[PDB]
Amino acid sequence: MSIFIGQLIGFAVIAFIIVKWVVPPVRTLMRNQQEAVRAALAESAEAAKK
Amino acid sequence: LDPNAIITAGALIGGGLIMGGGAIGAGIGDGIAGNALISGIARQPEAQGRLFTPFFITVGLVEAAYFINLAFMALFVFATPGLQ
Amino acid sequence: LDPNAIITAGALIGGGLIMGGGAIGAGIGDGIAGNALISGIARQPEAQGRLFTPFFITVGLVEAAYFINLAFMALFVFATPGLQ
Amino acid sequence: LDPNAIITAGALIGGGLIMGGGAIGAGIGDGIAGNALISGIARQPEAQGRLFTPFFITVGLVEAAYFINLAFMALFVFATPGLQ
Amino acid sequence: LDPNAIITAGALIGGGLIMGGGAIGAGIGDGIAGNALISGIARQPEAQGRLFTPFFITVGLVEAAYFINLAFMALFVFATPGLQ
Amino acid sequence: LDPNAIITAGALIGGGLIMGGGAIGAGIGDGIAGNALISGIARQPEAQGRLFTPFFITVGLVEAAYFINLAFMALFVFATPGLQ
Amino acid sequence: LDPNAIITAGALIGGGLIMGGGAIGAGIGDGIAGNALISGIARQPEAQGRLFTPFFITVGLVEAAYFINLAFMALFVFATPGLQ
Amino acid sequence: LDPNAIITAGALIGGGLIMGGGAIGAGIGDGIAGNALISGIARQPEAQGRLFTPFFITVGLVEAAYFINLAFMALFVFATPGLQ
Amino acid sequence: LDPNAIITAGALIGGGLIMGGGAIGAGIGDGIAGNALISGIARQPEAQGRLFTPFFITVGLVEAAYFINLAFMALFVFATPGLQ
Amino acid sequence: LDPNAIITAGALIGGGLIMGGGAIGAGIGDGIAGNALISGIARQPEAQGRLFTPFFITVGLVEAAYFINLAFMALFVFATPGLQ
Amino acid sequence: AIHVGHHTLVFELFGMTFNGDTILATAVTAVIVIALAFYLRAKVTSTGVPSGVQLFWEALTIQMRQQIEGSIGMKIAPFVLPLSVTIFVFILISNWLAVLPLQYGGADGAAAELYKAPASDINFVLALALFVFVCYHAAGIWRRGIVGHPIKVVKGHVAFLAPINIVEELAKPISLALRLFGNIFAGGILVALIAMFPWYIQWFPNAVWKTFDLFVGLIQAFIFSLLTILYFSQSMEL
Amino acid sequence: DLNVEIVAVERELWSGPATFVFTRTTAGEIGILPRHIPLVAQLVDDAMVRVEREGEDDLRIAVDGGFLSVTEETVRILVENAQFESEIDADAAKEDAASDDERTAAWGRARLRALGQI
Amino acid sequence: SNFLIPNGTFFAVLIIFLIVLGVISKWVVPPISKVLAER
């Protein structure tokens, strides 16, 4: 139980670190890829229109 | 005297040697690989990303030895072969 | 003779080996990584900002192999496995 | 004092030496080869594809030696020669 | 054979190993860092001050091992763990 | 104790030292030679064929020593000299 | 066996290890620093004097460790902790 | 205890140390010399035949030490000095 | 067993360790300093004399340390502390 | 048992350490000096004659260390100090 | 007290023992991977924007295909792509599940983990390593004949090193297994040691080690996949 | 003391003794002292040269696409365009920074380094 | 006791692995390659 509390606190610290300093850049990368592919699709559509 | 005592002392010394060798090897190998990475980044700033692939390929390799040693260390101290 | 005496002596020798290897590895790896860092900074005074990133990575791994050793030594001398 | 106990302790210490030496050799050799590979990739991006052919020859020669040692370590600790 | 005698002999051997490894690592790493610093001065003599920042970041990171390594040695010989 | 047991423990430790030294030498020498080979191939891709002729010569001199060393380990362990 | 005999034998072995590690570290570190100094003086003869300030800082940083070991080694072999 | 048993055990340990040191020296020296030869052939292919005269010297010296060790190690084990 | 026998055995082991460490340090350091000197000569035919000054200093900082070990080796072997 | 047995076993172990360290130092130092010589000859073909001198000085230092170790091992083994 | 090993849920069937804990962990990892795969199959869109799962899967596929193209060529060995990607995802998820807080007091001072990464069990790593071994050796046999392939591997780059060469042929699988095993095995032991401290001190070393172990697992999965691809290429040359 | 010659394409600019020549080659900074070894290097695209003389003030030069050649006696600096310290104008140099054209921004950076504004 | 020894689990894990591969080779890699090639 005591070690369970210790490891739970450790996991809370790990999750805080991840959300603070790891989630933001990864979310940015995912949004960047999604925007890039969306722009590629839209540019293909306008090329077909042209 | 208890023979298991002698066997346990031998196993502890053996595991000490295991991890001593593993530590020396891993520390020096990681230092050398990091020296290569830092020199490459300083000399070729644009290649900063490109170097992170081989570097870890090196790390994951060198540390192997250490960690493998670590495993056998346990086998010596926690599951001493021939302890009887 | 006391079996515990022999086991503890072996544990002490093992831990001595553990930190001998760990200190050798950590010192030499940090020295090599710092040599890379110092060279890079000497060439480019402004490269400092982009060199602490790989350097602190290289230290990290090289330090892990140190501290891990430390931990296991703490097991050897304070919680000696197989201590009858 | 159960001579088998003395033989087992000696075999454990010998296996510890074997794997410590193998670990040092493998770690340092892999570190040096990785340094070469990282520097080569830094000097030109294209070489990443081809440089792996020689590099992984070196790691092949290095690792093999280590693993040979590892094999004999088993022979030392699992089927101890001259165990009486 | 007083158990304390064997315990103290093992502790002294362990502490000797602590010193050997710590001294090797500290000396070699410090020499490597100093080599980097000396080369930096030779290349551009008026970068000395600027280089004292990374240099001390390395030296301490090396000495941090040594002194830490040293501390446990004082623990082995003066307050031996597991002393009967 | 049985003289053969002490002699066998000594032989096992000696063979362990033999293999540890051989593995350290082989691993580090192979790593260094491979570093030279990798750098040479990186600089001159056409040299890939040529550099194999000297590189393996080095691997001939390094491995051979290790193997010779390995040979004597067998002599220590399987037919222990001076074993009475 | 008088316990003091075992204590002093362990102390002598520990002092030998201390001196061996210290000498290895001092020799290799001094060699590396001197290599840096020779290369620098070859590059810039008029930086010679200005190159001694870092070199000594390196040497004093290295040599000191050596002497520290020596000091402790004296304690090991002249006022052995735990001696009866 | 048949004092010759301890004589033989010590002789085998000493011979193992001799072989380990000789193998480490030979392997690392041959690796370094081969690195020099490989780099020289890579950068100046025409100088191939020119580089083997010093190389055969270097290797020679290196190998010489190794071979000397062999002989002395044989002396330790096959005709152990100090046999009663 | 005669306690002085244990003292002398430990003293011999300690002296052997001292000599091994001193010789390793001396060989490596002198090799590195000589490598620097030879490279400097190769770059500049006429830089020879001006390079011998720093080189000797390096040798002085290495051999000296080595010879210091020699003294203590004698103190260990001939005037063994703690002999009784 | 016979004290001289313990004395001779310790002497053999110490001599093995002496020669192992001497061989390591000699091999690696000679290899490094030969690497410098080979690289220099590759850079400047005409430098062979001039380069031989500093190379011979370095090899002389290294071999002097090695042969001093050889002499002191011969002292330890053939005429063991402290022998009763 | 550590109790290194000592798998729980151990049962017996067909005259053979089975580590129930490792089976359960492997099954959970497989379920997670299959759930991700089937979610992707319900979200693959070559027209609209891709979801995060599609991004992750295609990132893995591009990395593995780039390695294959740079090593042996996709046309020669297409199966290597699914093999490497499944190996990578399996190992990665197995190692990363360990980060979840499951260690707890065993009512006797001995830490117990409800989930422990299967790679910490020799059976898992041996299974993956031997499967890869058989796979690329069969690929080599098919590429260059039943009799030519052993000749090619034994001969190596230089015939004189034939005794050396055979060793790597044996060392390739073992190195693949042990390299993984220890790297995960340590993760099990360290936390156990970190469990000996009081709860008010265990959190910091525990947090640091688990943060490092996330990276260790990621790198180990990457190394295993990359070396599998490289061995496949090396056995399918000429 | 060593002879420093700033030589441009259109004309030989400057020649005289000096005590220390600082600049920034491609790999990194460099300082040349009287008996420096023979050397040939390329200055960074926005390099600056500081020639410290005996009994005179530091000479700061903004260099455009230059080269450096340390010879057994003299240091020669080649320059497409080298501008001496007194001739720089802060306004134009600082304005040229961050420009779309890379050469213009490099020249502005060289001027700023020569001035000391960095 | 000597955790390095294999066990029956070796086979079971293989089973659980193979099906995963079977899924990946069927419903992951081909669709993803198709999407990439189409893009």
PDB file of N, CA and C in Angstrom, chain F residues 81-82, chain H residues 7-8 11-12 71-83, chain J residues 8 12 77-78:
ATOM      1  N   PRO F  81      47.217 -27.387 -16.698  1.00  0.00           N
ATOM      2  CA  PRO F  81      48.635 -27.674 -16.462  1.00  0.00           C
ATOM      3  C   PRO F  81      48.941 -27.760 -14.977  1.00  0.00           C
ATOM      4  N   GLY F  82      49.816 -28.697 -14.624  1.00  0.00           N
ATOM      5  CA  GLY F  82      50.210 -28.853 -13.239  1.00  0.00           C
ATOM      6  C   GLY F  82      49.096 -29.280 -12.316  1.00  0.00           C
TER       7      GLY F  82
ATOM      8  N   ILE H   7      50.448 -23.154  -4.719  1.00  0.00           N
ATOM      9  CA  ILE H   7      51.435 -22.681  -5.683  1.00  0.00           C
ATOM     10  C   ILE H   7      50.853 -22.725  -7.088  1.00  0.00           C
ATOM     11  N   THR H   8      50.244 -23.855  -7.450  1.00  0.00           N
ATOM     12  CA  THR H   8      49.699 -24.004  -8.794  1.00  0.00           C
ATOM     13  C   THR H   8      48.525 -23.062  -9.023  1.00  0.00           C
ATOM     14  N   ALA H  11      49.957 -19.692  -9.590  1.00  0.00           N
ATOM     15  CA  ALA H  11      50.621 -19.664 -10.887  1.00  0.00           C
ATOM     16  C   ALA H  11      49.613 -19.549 -12.016  1.00  0.00           C
ATOM     17  N   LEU H  12      48.511 -20.293 -11.928  1.00  0.00           N
ATOM     18  CA  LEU H  12      47.488 -20.212 -12.962  1.00  0.00           C
ATOM     19  C   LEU H  12      46.848 -18.832 -12.989  1.00  0.00           C
ATOM     20  N   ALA H  71      55.636 -16.550 -23.520  1.00  0.00           N
ATOM     21  CA  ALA H  71      56.735 -17.305 -22.940  1.00  0.00           C
ATOM     22  C   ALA H  71      56.671 -17.246 -21.424  1.00  0.00           C
ATOM     23  N   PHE H  72      56.591 -16.035 -20.872  1.00  0.00           N
ATOM     24  CA  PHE H  72      56.598 -15.911 -19.422  1.00  0.00           C
ATOM     25  C   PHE H  72      55.404 -16.628 -18.817  1.00  0.00           C
ATOM     26  N   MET H  73      54.232 -16.495 -19.436  1.00  0.00           N
ATOM     27  CA  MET H  73      53.073 -17.202 -18.911  1.00  0.00           C
ATOM     28  C   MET H  73      53.323 -18.701 -18.904  1.00  0.00           C
ATOM     29  N   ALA H  74      53.919 -19.229 -19.974  1.00  0.00           N
ATOM     30  CA  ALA H  74      54.281 -20.640 -19.965  1.00  0.00           C
ATOM     31  C   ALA H  74      55.143 -20.946 -18.752  1.00  0.00           C
ATOM     32  N   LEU H  75      56.171 -20.127 -18.523  1.00  0.00           N
ATOM     33  CA  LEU H  75      57.027 -20.324 -17.362  1.00  0.00           C
ATOM     34  C   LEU H  75      56.202 -20.393 -16.087  1.00  0.00           C
ATOM     35  N   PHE H  76      55.183 -19.543 -15.971  1.00  0.00           N
ATOM     36  CA  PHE H  76      54.377 -19.546 -14.757  1.00  0.00           C
ATOM     37  C   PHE H  76      53.657 -20.873 -14.575  1.00  0.00           C
ATOM     38  N   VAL H  77      53.128 -21.438 -15.654  1.00  0.00           N
ATOM     39  CA  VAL H  77      52.199 -22.554 -15.554  1.00  0.00           C
ATOM     40  C   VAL H  77      52.890 -23.893 -15.780  1.00  0.00           C
ATOM     41  N   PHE H  78      53.685 -24.018 -16.843  1.00  0.00           N
ATOM     42  CA  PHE H  78      54.280 -25.310 -17.160  1.00  0.00           C
ATOM     43  C   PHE H  78      55.423 -25.654 -16.215  1.00  0.00           C
ATOM     44  N   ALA H  79      56.291 -24.688 -15.914  1.00  0.00           N
ATOM     45  CA  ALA H  79      57.375 -24.873 -14.948  1.00  0.00           C
ATOM     46  C   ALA H  79      57.237 -23.764 -13.912  1.00  0.00           C
ATOM     47  N   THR H  80      56.364 -23.982 -12.943  1.00  0.00           N
ATOM     48  CA  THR H  80      56.011 -22.926 -12.006  1.00  0.00           C
ATOM     49  C   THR H  80      57.206 -22.596 -11.126  1.00  0.00           C
ATOM     50  N   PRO H  81      57.679 -21.352 -11.100  1.00  0.00           N
ATOM     51  CA  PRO H  81      58.742 -21.004 -10.154  1.00  0.00           C
ATOM     52  C   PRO H  81      58.281 -21.199  -8.720  1.00  0.00           C
ATOM     53  N   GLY H  82      59.187 -21.705  -7.888  1.00  0.00           N
ATOM     54  CA  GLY H  82      58.907 -21.863  -6.478  1.00  0.00           C
ATOM     55  C   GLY H  82      58.173 -23.126  -6.088  1.00  0.00           C
ATOM     56  N   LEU H  83      57.982 -24.070  -7.005  1.00  0.00           N
ATOM     57  CA  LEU H  83      57.367 -25.338  -6.633  1.00  0.00           C
ATOM     58  C   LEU H  83      58.172 -26.016  -5.534  1.00  0.00           C
TER      59      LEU H  83
ATOM     60  N   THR J   8      54.824 -17.644  -2.150  1.00  0.00           N
ATOM     61  CA  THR J   8      55.058 -17.844  -3.573  1.00  0.00           C
ATOM     62  C   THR J   8      53.782 -17.640  -4.378  1.00  0.00           C
ATOM     63  N   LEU J  12      53.533 -14.924  -7.307  1.00  0.00           N
ATOM     64  CA  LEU J  12      53.101 -15.227  -8.665  1.00  0.00           C
ATOM     65  C   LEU J  12      51.950 -14.327  -9.086  1.00  0.00           C
ATOM     66  N   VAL J  77      59.282 -13.087  -8.666  1.00  0.00           N
ATOM     67  CA  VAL J  77      59.034 -14.515  -8.811  1.00  0.00           C
ATOM     68  C   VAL J  77      60.281 -15.323  -8.473  1.00  0.00           C
ATOM     69  N   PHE J  78      61.411 -14.991  -9.098  1.00  0.00           N
ATOM     70  CA  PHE J  78      62.604 -15.817  -8.942  1.00  0.00           C
ATOM     71  C   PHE J  78      63.260 -15.610  -7.582  1.00  0.00           C
TER      72      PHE J  78
END
